[PDB]
Amino acid sequence: KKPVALIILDGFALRDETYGNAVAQANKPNFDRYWNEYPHTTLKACGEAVGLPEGQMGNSEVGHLNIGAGRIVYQSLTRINIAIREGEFDRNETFLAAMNHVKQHGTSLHLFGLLSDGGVHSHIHHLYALLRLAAKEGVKRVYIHGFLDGRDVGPQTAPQYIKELQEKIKEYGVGEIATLSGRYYSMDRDKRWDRVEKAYRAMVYGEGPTYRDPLECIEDSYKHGIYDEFVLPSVIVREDGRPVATIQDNDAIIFYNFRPDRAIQISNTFTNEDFREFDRGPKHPKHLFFVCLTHFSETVAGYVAFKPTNLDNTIGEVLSQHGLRQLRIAETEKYPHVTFFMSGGREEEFPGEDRILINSPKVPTYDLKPEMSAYEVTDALLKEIEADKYDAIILNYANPDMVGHSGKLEPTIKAVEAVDECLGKVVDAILAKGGIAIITADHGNADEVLTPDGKPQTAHTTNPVPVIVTKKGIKLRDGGILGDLAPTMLDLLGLPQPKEMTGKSLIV
Ligand SMILES: [Mn+2]
Ligand SMILES: [Mn+2]
């Protein structure tokens, strides 16, 4: 069994400047030899090249969606942007139905979402559109519960978004910031239900640090070294000390996040009839008209404003269709991208698809353990390779992206070095097995963890990703995009490529 393996170095891109570039500064003997000894090229992993507005950096969802699809996958951010531009956003029946509910049953409208213009999980401009729409629809009571970013934008940038929002609220004549919480608590994706609960109880019970001014809340957090991303779920209160607003029975909630992985958990806490992860308290809110901007999961008992469209014949499906055995492997942090997103937004496994989940280290931030679980993932898979069970393999090494998000150079360099070591073991095992490896990445991050002034850079970059096909004797085209990865794999697998896959094999 000569396996063909697609190895994704999450957040590993190619950038010339070496300043703050942990990818370049790291000692990657393994990666370097393969780059030198095997055919390679770079791919566009951002902007229109992956279904995003021009300029928009890529990410795991977008990245894994496009890699697994073998075509340019139209993204949510773009789609909604167009809706707002074409005046279709204001005609959305789900939004209107939610607005009618609060008006008809005299309740309140609550707006959930990442407060920033990162564009990865949301865009603050989408929130303003809802605020403008709520004002147009005559919705009296509108409350904003913002989740502070600092991961897709500057580490301490919330003040400007809060400011801009406050200005929009005044202009539009509706809205009131009710709570502010770091996305660390309100947008967890590791089933750390303790974090989630914290966000929940601030929102529905008004429990947590209380302030009368959104900005003083932020000022105070920064004062304690707690920045945007990690801001404790706080509650804004009125002159009478009472919370500005708490989610109650029959209230409506519009969660303006369009990325699912970090939205499902809190969405379940709110809509799940029977919920066990933790005790929501006996007086917890019921009968909430819950609206998801896009589809999060079948579990979320709520409506979807922008309904999804099937992604047919993604590599997972073509491999399965041809009786091949495939394995998806990754540690917690990237398990959803190597499975859900890779499979074209599909939850259920394909027949013949196996999955291995390795638990990420039990650390708050991964700068505290740069090697994360890279070693456990390598050992588990090395075993799978010795067994000779799989035809295709999809491995994702989260380290570069996860610790690069810390905005720290040394830890990110350590991370990159840890993965290189692992990468050599994996590819060397593949080759020894007579198989071929496609070493690549979904987008950049670790190529820039410091700003020009030397400050922490906690977000992705727009740099191209590397592409190595460990198959001597071949050449790779150059104007490639992620959507060209799947066709190349099928090419290597010698399987026919579906018409759906509009991408082109990188092999000449
Ligand atoms: Mn990624
Ligand atoms: Mn990332």
mmCIF file with all atom_site columns, C-alpha atoms and ligand atoms in Angstrom, residues 10-11 59-60 151-152 189 334 401-402 405 443-445 460, ligand 2:
data_model
loop_
_atom_site.group_PDB
_atom_site.id
_atom_site.type_symbol
_atom_site.label_atom_id
_atom_site.label_alt_id
_atom_site.label_comp_id
_atom_site.label_asym_id
_atom_site.label_entity_id
_atom_site.label_seq_id
_atom_site.pdbx_PDB_ins_code
_atom_site.Cartn_x
_atom_site.Cartn_y
_atom_site.Cartn_z
_atom_site.occupancy
_atom_site.B_iso_or_equiv
_atom_site.pdbx_formal_charge
_atom_site.auth_seq_id
_atom_site.auth_comp_id
_atom_site.auth_asym_id
_atom_site.auth_atom_id
_atom_site.pdbx_PDB_model_num
ATOM   1  C  CA . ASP A 1 10  ? -1.454  25.032 9.598  1.00 0.00 ? 10  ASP A CA 1
ATOM   2  C  CA . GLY A 1 11  ? -0.398  28.677 9.398  1.00 0.00 ? 11  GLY A CA 1
ATOM   3  C  CA . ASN A 1 59  ? -8.083  30.817 7.434  1.00 0.00 ? 59  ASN A CA 1
ATOM   4  C  CA . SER A 1 60  ? -8.650  27.182 8.394  1.00 0.00 ? 60  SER A CA 1
ATOM   5  C  CA . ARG A 1 151 ? -7.012  37.172 17.467 1.00 0.00 ? 151 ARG A CA 1
ATOM   6  C  CA . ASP A 1 152 ? -8.068  38.199 13.958 1.00 0.00 ? 152 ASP A CA 1
ATOM   7  C  CA . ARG A 1 189 ? -14.423 25.213 20.240 1.00 0.00 ? 189 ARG A CA 1
ATOM   8  C  CA . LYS A 1 334 ? -7.645  21.428 14.061 1.00 0.00 ? 334 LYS A CA 1
ATOM   9  C  CA . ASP A 1 401 ? -1.049  28.556 13.562 1.00 0.00 ? 401 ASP A CA 1
ATOM   10 C  CA . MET A 1 402 ? -2.035  27.854 17.144 1.00 0.00 ? 402 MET A CA 1
ATOM   11 C  CA . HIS A 1 405 ? -1.631  33.284 17.170 1.00 0.00 ? 405 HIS A CA 1
ATOM   12 C  CA . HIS A 1 443 ? -2.764  29.917 5.019  1.00 0.00 ? 443 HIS A CA 1
ATOM   13 C  CA . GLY A 1 444 ? -0.119  32.046 6.753  1.00 0.00 ? 444 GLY A CA 1
ATOM   14 C  CA . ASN A 1 445 ? 0.346   33.151 10.345 1.00 0.00 ? 445 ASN A CA 1
ATOM   15 C  CA . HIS A 1 460 ? -3.066  35.396 9.833  1.00 0.00 ? 460 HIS A CA 1
HETATM 16 MN MN . MN  B 2 .   ? -5.306  30.618 12.792 1.00 0.00 ? 2   MN  B MN 1
#
